[PDB]
Protein backbone atom coordinates (compact mmCIF):
# COMPACT_ATOMS: atom_id res chain seq x y z
CA UNK A 1 0.00 0.00 0.00
CA UNK A 2 0.97 3.51 -1.13
CA UNK A 3 0.87 6.30 1.49
CA UNK A 4 -1.82 8.40 -0.85
CA UNK A 5 -3.79 4.69 -0.86
CA UNK A 6 -3.74 5.38 3.10
CA UNK A 7 -4.61 8.90 3.21
CA UNK A 8 -7.58 8.30 0.94
CA UNK A 9 -8.60 5.18 2.92
CA UNK A 10 -9.12 7.31 6.40
CA UNK A 11 -10.55 10.57 4.29
CA UNK A 12 -13.48 8.13 3.23
CA UNK A 13 -13.92 7.03 6.95
CA UNK A 14 -14.21 10.85 7.48
CA UNK A 15 -10.63 11.55 8.88
CA UNK A 16 -8.08 14.35 7.95
CA UNK A 17 -5.29 12.73 6.78
CA UNK A 18 -1.71 13.80 5.60
CA UNK A 19 1.95 12.47 4.30
CA UNK A 20 4.53 13.64 6.57
CA UNK A 21 8.33 12.90 6.74
CA UNK A 22 10.93 11.09 8.87
CA UNK A 23 12.88 14.51 8.96
CA UNK A 24 10.14 16.82 9.88
CA UNK A 25 10.02 14.78 13.44
CA UNK A 26 13.71 15.49 13.69
CA UNK A 27 14.22 13.50 17.06
CA UNK A 28 11.17 12.36 17.49
CA UNK A 29 11.73 8.83 15.55
CA UNK A 30 13.65 7.00 17.55
CA UNK A 31 15.55 3.62 16.12
CA UNK A 32 13.37 0.14 17.29
CA UNK A 33 15.26 -1.68 20.14
CA UNK A 34 14.82 -5.27 20.27
CA UNK A 35 14.75 -4.88 23.83
CA UNK A 36 11.61 -2.82 23.42
CA UNK A 37 7.90 -3.87 24.26
CA UNK A 38 5.60 -4.58 20.96
CA UNK A 39 2.93 -2.66 22.71
CA UNK A 40 -0.54 -0.53 22.25
CA UNK A 41 -1.08 2.24 20.41
CA UNK A 42 -2.45 4.45 23.69
CA UNK A 43 -0.86 7.89 24.17
CA UNK A 44 -1.02 7.96 28.10
CA UNK A 45 1.61 6.87 30.61
CA UNK A 46 2.23 3.69 31.68
CA UNK A 47 4.59 1.51 34.16
CA UNK A 48 6.57 0.41 30.70
CA UNK A 49 10.42 0.71 31.32
CA UNK A 50 11.05 -1.68 27.86
CA UNK A 51 11.12 1.51 25.36
CA UNK A 52 11.38 1.39 21.70
CA UNK A 53 9.46 -1.34 20.32
CA UNK A 54 6.95 -1.49 17.86
CA UNK A 55 3.06 0.29 18.25
CA UNK A 56 0.21 -2.11 16.79
CA UNK A 57 -3.28 -2.03 18.71
CA UNK A 58 -3.64 -4.09 21.85
CA UNK A 59 -0.23 -4.96 21.43
CA UNK A 60 0.22 -8.06 20.27
CA UNK A 61 -3.21 -8.62 19.70
CA UNK A 62 -3.35 -7.06 17.05
CA UNK A 63 -1.40 -9.80 15.27
CA UNK A 64 -4.34 -12.43 17.26
CA UNK A 65 -6.93 -10.49 16.22
CA UNK A 66 -5.73 -9.59 12.33
CA UNK A 67 -5.45 -13.83 11.73
CA UNK A 68 -8.80 -14.65 13.93
CA UNK A 69 -6.14 -16.89 16.35
CA UNK A 70 -8.93 -16.97 19.05
CA UNK A 71 -7.76 -19.46 22.05
CA UNK A 72 -5.36 -18.80 24.55
CA UNK A 73 -2.86 -21.91 23.11
CA UNK A 74 -2.68 -19.61 19.93
CA UNK A 75 -1.76 -16.75 21.99
CA UNK A 76 0.94 -18.28 23.90
CA UNK A 77 2.09 -19.02 20.55
CA UNK A 78 2.12 -15.22 18.83
CA UNK A 79 4.25 -14.52 21.81
CA UNK A 80 6.85 -16.74 21.70
CA UNK A 81 6.93 -15.96 17.88
CA UNK A 82 7.17 -11.76 18.33
CA UNK A 83 10.20 -12.62 21.04
CA UNK A 84 11.70 -14.97 18.53
CA UNK A 85 11.31 -11.86 15.65
CA UNK A 86 13.44 -9.25 17.77
CA UNK A 87 10.22 -7.70 20.01
CA UNK A 88 9.58 -8.13 23.65
CA UNK A 89 5.64 -9.33 23.08
CA UNK A 90 3.18 -7.36 25.88
CA UNK A 91 -0.71 -6.86 25.90
CA UNK A 92 -2.17 -4.15 28.32
CA UNK A 93 -4.75 -2.90 30.70
CA UNK A 94 -4.96 -0.33 33.26
CA UNK A 95 -8.49 -0.78 35.13
CA UNK A 96 -11.37 -3.34 34.85
CA UNK A 97 -14.00 -3.83 37.20
CA UNK A 98 -16.13 -5.70 35.12
CA UNK A 99 -13.57 -8.41 33.74
CA UNK A 100 -13.53 -7.11 29.78
CA UNK A 101 -10.26 -5.56 30.20
CA UNK A 102 -9.89 -2.09 27.84
CA UNK A 103 -8.56 -0.64 24.82
CA UNK A 104 -8.56 -2.42 21.81
CA UNK A 105 -8.97 -6.01 23.36
CA UNK A 106 -12.07 -4.50 25.25
CA UNK A 107 -13.62 -3.52 22.09
CA UNK A 108 -12.79 -6.99 20.68
CA UNK A 109 -14.20 -9.17 23.20
CA UNK A 110 -17.66 -6.76 23.39
CA UNK A 111 -18.33 -7.76 19.53
CA UNK A 112 -17.00 -4.08 18.07
CA UNK A 113 -15.56 -5.96 15.29
CA UNK A 114 -17.98 -8.22 14.67
CA UNK A 115 -18.76 -6.43 11.44
CA UNK A 116 -15.88 -6.85 10.01
CA UNK A 117 -15.92 -10.55 9.99
CA UNK A 118 -14.07 -10.75 13.29
CA UNK A 119 -14.31 -13.59 15.35
CA UNK A 120 -14.26 -13.13 19.23
CA UNK A 121 -11.75 -14.26 21.98
CA UNK A 122 -12.32 -17.39 23.91
CA UNK A 123 -10.30 -16.46 27.02
CA UNK A 124 -10.87 -13.07 29.30
CA UNK A 125 -8.20 -10.08 29.68
CA UNK A 126 -6.60 -11.69 32.98
CA UNK A 127 -6.15 -14.86 31.41
CA UNK A 128 -4.63 -12.77 28.06
CA UNK A 129 -2.36 -11.55 30.61
CA UNK A 130 -1.45 -14.06 32.64
CA UNK A 131 -1.02 -16.70 29.26
CA UNK A 132 1.39 -13.80 27.66
CA UNK A 133 3.38 -13.73 30.96
CA UNK A 134 3.78 -16.90 31.10
CA UNK A 135 4.87 -17.40 27.69
CA UNK A 136 7.77 -14.68 28.39
CA UNK A 137 5.70 -11.30 27.82
CA UNK A 138 5.20 -8.26 29.43
CA UNK A 139 1.87 -7.01 30.78
CA UNK A 140 2.11 -2.82 30.68
CA UNK A 141 -0.71 -1.21 33.07
CA UNK A 142 -1.47 2.89 31.82
CA UNK A 143 -2.56 5.15 33.87
CA UNK A 144 -4.40 9.02 33.26
CA UNK A 145 -7.09 9.71 30.78
CA UNK A 146 -7.24 9.56 27.29
CA UNK A 147 -5.47 12.93 25.79
CA UNK A 148 -4.28 11.81 22.07
CA UNK A 149 -4.50 14.77 19.99
CA UNK A 150 -3.11 13.28 16.41
CA UNK A 151 -2.43 9.44 15.56
CA UNK A 152 0.71 8.99 13.53
CA UNK A 153 0.67 5.86 10.86
CA UNK A 154 4.59 5.15 10.87
CA UNK A 155 5.79 3.47 7.44
CA UNK A 156 9.25 3.55 8.29
CA UNK A 157 10.89 0.51 8.86
CA UNK A 158 12.36 -0.51 11.71
CA UNK A 159 11.66 3.02 13.35
CA UNK A 160 8.77 4.11 15.73
CA UNK A 161 7.24 6.96 17.61
CA UNK A 162 7.19 6.96 21.70
CA UNK A 163 4.65 7.71 23.78
CA UNK A 164 4.52 11.53 25.84
CA UNK A 165 1.49 11.77 28.32
CA UNK A 166 1.65 15.34 28.27
CA UNK A 167 1.38 15.72 25.03
CA UNK A 168 -0.28 12.42 23.78
CA UNK A 169 -0.60 10.58 20.31
CA UNK A 170 -1.49 7.18 19.00
CA UNK A 171 1.18 5.75 17.99
CA UNK A 172 0.87 2.77 14.93
CA UNK A 173 3.31 1.36 13.49
CA UNK A 174 2.08 -0.27 9.85
CA UNK A 175 5.45 -1.29 8.71
CA UNK A 176 5.34 -3.71 11.62
CA UNK A 177 1.98 -5.40 9.98
CA UNK A 178 3.89 -6.30 7.30
CA UNK A 179 6.79 -7.79 9.25
CA UNK A 180 4.13 -10.40 10.76
CA UNK A 181 2.93 -11.37 7.08
CA UNK A 182 -0.16 -9.77 8.68
CA UNK A 183 -3.50 -8.36 5.98
CA UNK A 184 -2.27 -4.91 6.13
CA UNK A 185 -5.41 -3.32 4.64
CA UNK A 186 -7.40 -5.25 7.29
CA UNK A 187 -5.13 -4.17 9.63
CA UNK A 188 -5.04 -0.34 8.73
CA UNK A 189 -8.52 -0.30 8.94
CA UNK A 190 -8.96 -2.17 12.34
CA UNK A 191 -6.74 0.82 14.04
CA UNK A 192 -8.70 3.69 12.27
CA UNK A 193 -11.78 1.91 14.20
CA UNK A 194 -9.89 1.15 17.25
CA UNK A 195 -8.69 4.71 17.24
CA UNK A 196 -12.69 6.08 16.32
CA UNK A 197 -14.35 3.55 18.83
CA UNK A 198 -12.38 4.70 21.60
CA UNK A 199 -13.29 8.10 21.34
CA UNK A 200 -10.11 9.36 19.47
CA UNK A 201 -9.31 11.81 17.04
CA UNK A 202 -9.73 10.75 13.17
CA UNK A 203 -6.23 13.23 12.39
CA UNK A 204 -3.87 10.96 10.58
CA UNK A 205 -0.53 12.19 9.89
CA UNK A 206 0.84 9.27 8.02
CA UNK A 207 5.43 8.94 8.11
CA UNK A 208 7.35 7.94 4.97
CA UNK A 209 10.85 7.71 4.71
Given at each position: ????????A????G?????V?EF??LN???????QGI?K????????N????G??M???????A??R???????????T?EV?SK??????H???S?????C?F????V??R???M????????????AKAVE??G???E???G?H???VV?????????L???E??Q?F?????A???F???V????????AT???????????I???
Amino acid sequence: LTPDQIVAALQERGWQAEIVTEFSLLNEMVDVDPQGILKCVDGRGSDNTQFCGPKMPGGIYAIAHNRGVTTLEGLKQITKEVASKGHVPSVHGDHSSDMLGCGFFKLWVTGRFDDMGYPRPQFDADQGAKAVENAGGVIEMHHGSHAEKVVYINLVENKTLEPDEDDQRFIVDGWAAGKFGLDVPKFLIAAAATVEMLGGPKKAKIVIP
